[PDB]
């Protein structure tokens, strides 16, 4: 089934909002990401999806029913919940047998279900200890399979790879995707980390302060941030914003002036004449002017600002000045003077008096 958060909102006494009517839908068998800062409401939303937090206002609908108040058994959905809980005073195996025991299956069927289940998610080689013997990452992967086995109407999953190294994390990410594919089941992972999000979601929702900031595909959000917040949130290192001003040809910058593409000029002229602009640019587009061909010299502004420091990270020289992220192919050194190059095609415009992406489709 599809799920639908129609204006769903939460307020609690210190009354104050934890969610200011954030709104969404998840299509049948879709994979979503939610992402946002700590305390931005996601823990609310999953408690609200469970029908266990009080939905203070709005309308959760699923499968043709309004369901804001329905208990988890009535909902027929599960959480791969952040606390990575599976039972002490019990076996590892019995923690994964608990849902199966609620499902009260035939014992041979149960042993087969466990056998596939524990060939999956296999954080111990079916070690089947008392779980307090195992490592926290192993427990996390165990709690993962432990929730995973039931194939409910939907799944929610809570930044689980944070408990793990990145190598095994991406392996578990791929496994997790293959699982959701094989399940074809309505799904959301949740994180604070956009690097996880951009690979995992068919469509990401982003929050700040109990409100949705945008919804779309990962490359929609990357191509077309809805506001200066999500433009600052996306990418790594994050988008450079520099103080800039309008010109009839395009823009004026801290170190020069640039022509704007005709369609962006047309939209900028359908828009107001703002006093201040954040030019949004991904720092990785910036290069040493020594590296350019003639086509790039046509397409790019080049200008000089001191490399006040130069870190280098194998991919880039992280040129501090602010940051300017040239390829490490440029042999520029810490504290040097340099001429930077940037493709004039790539600059996003934000009106710095409002934070709206003036360049956005």
């Amino acid at each position: 089934a599809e799920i639908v958060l129609d204006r769903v909102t939460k307020s609690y006494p210190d009354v104050r909002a934890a969610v200011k009517e954030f709104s969404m839908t998840i299509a049948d068998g879709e994979f979503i990401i939610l992402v946002g800062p700590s305390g931005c409401g996601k823990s609310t939303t999953l408690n609200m999806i469970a029908g266990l937090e009080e939905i203070t206002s709005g309308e959760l609908r699923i499968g043709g029913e309004r369901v804001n108040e329905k208990a988890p058994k009535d909902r027929d959905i599960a959480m791969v919940f952040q606390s990575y809980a599976l039972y002490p005073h019990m076996t590892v195996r019995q923690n994964i047998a608990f849902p199966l025991t609620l499902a009260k299956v035939p014992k041979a069927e149960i042993a087969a279900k466990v056998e596939e289940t524990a060939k999956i998610l296999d954080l111990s080689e079916l070690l089947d200890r008392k779980p307090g013997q195992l490592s926290g990452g192993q427990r996390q992967r165990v709690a993962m399979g432990r929730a995973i086995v039931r194939s409910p109407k939907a799944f929610l999953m809570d930044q689980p790879l944070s408990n793990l190294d990145a190598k095994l994390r991406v392996q578990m990410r791929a496994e997790i995707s293959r699982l959701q594919d094989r399940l074809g089941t309505t799904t959301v992972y949740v994180t604070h980390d956009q690097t996880e999000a951009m690979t995992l979601g068919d469509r990401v929702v982003v929050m700040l302060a109990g409100e949705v900031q945008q919804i779309g595909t990962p490359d929609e959000l990357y191509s077309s941030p809805a506001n200066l917040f999500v433009a600052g949130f996306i990418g790594s290192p994050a988008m450079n914003f520099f103080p800039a001003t309008r010109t009839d040809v395009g823009v004026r910058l801290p170190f020069g002036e640039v022509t704007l593409t005709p369609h962006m000029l047309d939209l900028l002229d359908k828009q107001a004449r703002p006093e201040n602009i954040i030019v949004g640019i991904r720092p990785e587009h910036i290069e040493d002017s020594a590296l350019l061909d003639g086509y790039a010299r046509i397409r790019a502004l080049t200008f000089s600002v001191r490399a006040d420091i130069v870190e280098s990270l194998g991919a880039d020289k992280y040129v501090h000045f602010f940051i300017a992220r040239v390829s490490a192919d440029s042999r520029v050194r810490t504290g040097e003077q340099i001429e930077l190059a940037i493709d004039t095609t790539k600059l996003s415009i934000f009106d710095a008096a409002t934070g709206l992406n003036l360049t956005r489709d």
Partner: protein, 284 residues
Amino acid sequence: KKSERRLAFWLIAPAVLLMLAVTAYPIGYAVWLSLQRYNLAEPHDTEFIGLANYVTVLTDGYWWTAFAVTLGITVVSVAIEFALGLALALVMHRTIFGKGAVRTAILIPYGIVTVAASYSWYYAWTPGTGYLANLLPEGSAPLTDQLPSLAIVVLAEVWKTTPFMALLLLAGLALVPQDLLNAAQVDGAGPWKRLTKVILPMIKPAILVALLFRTLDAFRIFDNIYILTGGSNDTGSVSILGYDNLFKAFNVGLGSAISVLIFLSVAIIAFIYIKIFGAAAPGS
């Protein structure tokens, strides 16, 4: 390392030394008095008894029925005080009201002087005067009859015994972070089944140690039954029986034997709650 073992023993040394002195030598003396044939009216002529002190008690129906009535009272009081105390702990935990009110409500019946409780119930059940007796149909005579009187004293002692073990079980759930219960009712929604089939596993020594103790506390009874009856309706407690042989008749030969076999009669149930059910200490 010898040093840190030695300092641990030095910290134990006063407590264990006096803890031996205040019990072991008294007990050794008590069994020697059970070897003795003695009366306090004529203490000097104390020959040995040829196990006869024990032989009298194990021969005696009054002892056996006094034993049996305490077994009856203890098991049922254990059962009900547990059954109540479990719910009491859960409501004292999960009430939406100001929890200091329920915390106040439960501590006072735990704290009140047991004798005063004994009197209050005794008067409540005195016919005509006692409102609880007075409301019945006439000729019921609640104090006159064994099973009614027994039932009443159980129904009296609960208002002192269970609030303590409900507090014990409250700490017995303070050791459980409530988010674990939340994690249990995630998936496992339906808290009648959920809260039981989690607390059943989850309470390892939280409840166990709260069963054997209350049980021996109950077996230690020497009060409410006594003031309620003097052992009449044949409602004699083994404690009252011990007192009866000693302060009414001064047969220390019998009374010491009774004392020590009562000490064996705790030792067996304590040993059961070591050898059986696991029943290990909470630090195990």
